[PDB]
Amino acid sequence: MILSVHILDQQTGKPAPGVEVVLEQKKDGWTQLNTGHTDQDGRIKALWPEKAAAPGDYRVIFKTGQYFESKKLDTFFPEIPVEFHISKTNEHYHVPLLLSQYGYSTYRGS
Amino acid sequence: MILSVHILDQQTGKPAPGVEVVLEQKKDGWTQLNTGHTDQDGRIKALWPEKAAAPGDYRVIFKTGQYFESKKLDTFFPEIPVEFHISKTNEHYHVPLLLSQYGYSTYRGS
Amino acid sequence: MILSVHILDQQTGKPAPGVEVVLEQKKDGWTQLNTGHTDQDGRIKALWPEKAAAPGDYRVIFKTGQYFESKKLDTFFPEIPVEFHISKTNEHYHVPLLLSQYGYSTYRGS
Amino acid sequence: MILSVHILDQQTGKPAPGVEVVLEQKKDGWTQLNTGHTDQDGRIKALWPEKAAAPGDYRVIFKTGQYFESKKLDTFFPEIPVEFHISKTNEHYHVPLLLSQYGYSTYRGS
């Protein structure tokens, strides 16, 4: 199992650097597996480095509220959580974020 | 304060009906204010009917996992949470969801 | 046949007013049916007012380059064209635009 | 100047292969610079291979209508054109497409 994220700032058309991202797993609420920060190219390649994982519900929380605060920009979102389910645990999963101040998009990248 | 949501199925180009949506407020974790289901036109007009509200972080959870399950369709998301912050509590807030099986978009509508 | 558009500024979370939109039909290249400008609520309700229409390929061009220029903002797009096909000419068609400086989304609204 | 595109099928969460993409430049209408087809990973890495280019308005046309037709799926779009402007001709430009049947997203990737 590999989990990658990358954030794209839609206001600038450039990647969003230094954004905190929290990875969680749904247990019998949610529990932290890892916490990372997006690099110069707005990426966290191994979130989650290549290791075996149990299937089930996962979550990434993009700390984008703190990101816009440091730029002195207003935003609709205090943070952006993305819930996803993994049944094929062998695969590399990309969960990108297309970030605007008052809107966003996310998907399997794959 | 007014809170509305509407879901648009991107596979069909038609609204997504009968989808459960849970509205929550961040307290000193999260607490349910109301639970609704999208109508024939994929809307929940008053989520949250017109009443005074305290500023702070809110959340809507679109139960889209159960939606695709009833259509016998696979999806990346077990559900879709959307976190948002309200500072101007006088306003009508639209939080629409553009729904695909393995991707989505959300925004202030406004 | 009814054709509506509305533009949502993702930087502000408010509708985008005064944006020129050109409606075209594919002929044996493209030909202008109508030209409108988005109102205070970022809408052009009747683009295209309620009248019978021939099925086929249509196009709306959102003059968003001129929009950002008047705000002194840079953008990736000189304008945003959206091609769509209508087979059911009886229906009301919404073609909304979720507008960021360096990214956008469009869909049937319906 | 480098121009890359990649298409992501939002219905499947996998890249969209074998999709024709036409690259054009705005002249004193539009003129074809190159035509490519997306590979197994839904990419056209060099659209446009690394060569010097003149600044101005460009266009990529994603032949997504023909794509869904071969899958026997209905779609709102006969094809998807994306207009973009390049002022810094030294840079590598990614223009990805997040593809659903009745909706899509595009952006600088960068």
Side-chain angles (χ1 to χ4, degrees), chain A residues 1-2 4-25 29-50 52-65 67-68 70-73 75-87 89-110, chain B residues 1-2 4-25 29-50 52-65 67-68 70-73 75-87 89-110, chain C residues 1-2 4-25 29-50 52-65 67-68 70-73 75-87 89-110, chain D residues 1-2 4-25 29-50 52-65 67-68 70-73 75-87 89-110:
Chain A
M1 225 270 281
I2 311 162
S4 306
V5 302
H6 76 268
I7 309 164
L8 202 139
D9 200 317
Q10 226 93 316
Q11 277 85 203
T12 67
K14 319 278 183 186
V19 189
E20 190 189 326
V21 186
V22 178
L23 173 67
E24 282 175 294
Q25 190 189 0
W30 302 90
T31 65
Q32 276 175 20
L33 292 172
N34 202 20
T35 303
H37 292 256
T38 57
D39 59 20
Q40 321 103 113
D41 300 343
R43 304 184 179 276
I44 308 170
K45 289 176 280 175
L47 195 42
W48 221 262
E50 195 172 21
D57 296 340
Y58 289 86
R59 192 171 68 181
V60 287
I61 301 173
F62 299 95
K63 256 70 177 170
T64 58
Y67 169 71
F68 286 122
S70 61
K71 293 179 79 195
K72 258 71 223 304
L73 296 174
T75 182
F76 197 37
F77 322 100
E79 61 187 18
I80 298 164
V82 182
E83 279 193 61
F84 55 96
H85 180 87
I86 297 156
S87 43
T89 61
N90 63 113
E91 302 195 7
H92 186 152
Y93 290 87
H94 293 266
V95 190
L97 181 74
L98 310 181
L99 221 207
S100 301
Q101 291 170 247
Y102 293 87
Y104 65 88
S105 302
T106 191
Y107 53 99
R108 210 208 152 165
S110 306
Chain B
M1 225 270 281
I2 311 162
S4 306
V5 302
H6 76 268
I7 309 164
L8 202 139
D9 200 317
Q10 226 93 316
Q11 277 85 203
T12 67
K14 319 278 183 186
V19 189
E20 190 189 326
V21 186
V22 178
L23 173 67
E24 282 175 294
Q25 190 189 0
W30 302 90
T31 65
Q32 276 175 20
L33 292 172
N34 202 20
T35 303
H37 292 256
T38 57
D39 59 20
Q40 321 103 113
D41 300 343
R43 304 184 179 276
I44 308 170
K45 289 176 280 175
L47 195 42
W48 221 262
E50 195 172 21
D57 296 340
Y58 289 86
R59 192 171 68 181
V60 287
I61 301 173
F62 299 95
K63 256 70 177 170
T64 58
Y67 169 71
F68 286 122
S70 61
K71 293 179 79 195
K72 258 71 223 304
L73 296 174
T75 182
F76 197 37
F77 322 100
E79 61 187 18
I80 298 164
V82 182
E83 279 193 61
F84 55 96
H85 180 87
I86 297 156
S87 43
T89 61
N90 63 113
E91 302 195 7
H92 186 152
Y93 290 87
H94 293 266
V95 190
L97 181 74
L98 310 181
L99 221 207
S100 301
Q101 291 170 247
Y102 293 87
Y104 65 88
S105 302
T106 191
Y107 53 99
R108 210 208 152 165
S110 306
Chain C
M1 226 269 281
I2 311 162
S4 306
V5 302
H6 76 268
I7 310 164
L8 202 139
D9 200 318
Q10 226 93 316
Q11 277 85 203
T12 67
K14 319 278 183 186
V19 189
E20 190 189 326
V21 186
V22 178
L23 173 67
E24 282 175 294
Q25 190 189 1
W30 302 90
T31 65
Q32 276 175 20
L33 292 172
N34 202 21
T35 303
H37 291 256
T38 57
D39 59 20
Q40 321 103 113
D41 301 343
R43 304 185 178 275
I44 308 170
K45 289 176 280 175
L47 195 42
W48 221 261
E50 194 173 20
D57 296 340
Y58 289 86
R59 191 171 68 181
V60 287
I61 301 173
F62 298 95
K63 256 70 177 169
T64 57
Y67 169 71
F68 287 122
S70 61
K71 293 180 79 195
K72 258 71 223 303
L73 296 174
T75 182
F76 197 37
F77 322 100
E79 61 187 18
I80 298 164
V82 182
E83 279 193 61
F84 55 96
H85 180 87
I86 297 156
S87 42
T89 60
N90 63 113
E91 301 195 7
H92 186 152
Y93 290 87
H94 293 266
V95 190
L97 181 74
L98 310 181
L99 221 208
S100 300
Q101 290 171 248
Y102 293 87
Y104 65 88
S105 301
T106 191
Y107 53 99
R108 210 208 152 165
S110 306
Chain D
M1 226 269 281
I2 311 162
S4 306
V5 302
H6 76 268
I7 310 164
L8 202 139
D9 200 318
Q10 226 93 316
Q11 277 85 203
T12 67
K14 319 278 183 186
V19 189
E20 190 189 326
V21 186
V22 178
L23 173 67
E24 282 175 294
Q25 190 189 1
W30 302 90
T31 65
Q32 276 175 20
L33 292 172
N34 202 21
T35 303
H37 291 256
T38 57
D39 59 20
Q40 321 103 113
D41 301 343
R43 304 185 178 275
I44 308 170
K45 289 176 280 175
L47 195 42
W48 221 261
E50 194 173 20
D57 296 340
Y58 289 86
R59 191 171 68 181
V60 287
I61 301 173
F62 298 95
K63 256 70 177 169
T64 57
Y67 169 71
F68 287 122
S70 61
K71 293 180 79 195
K72 258 71 223 303
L73 296 174
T75 182
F76 197 37
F77 322 100
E79 61 187 18
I80 298 164
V82 182
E83 279 193 61
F84 55 96
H85 180 87
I86 297 156
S87 42
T89 60
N90 63 113
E91 301 195 7
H92 186 152
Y93 290 87
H94 293 266
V95 190
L97 181 74
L98 310 181
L99 221 208
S100 300
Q101 290 171 248
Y102 293 87
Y104 65 88
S105 301
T106 191
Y107 53 99
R108 210 208 152 165
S110 306

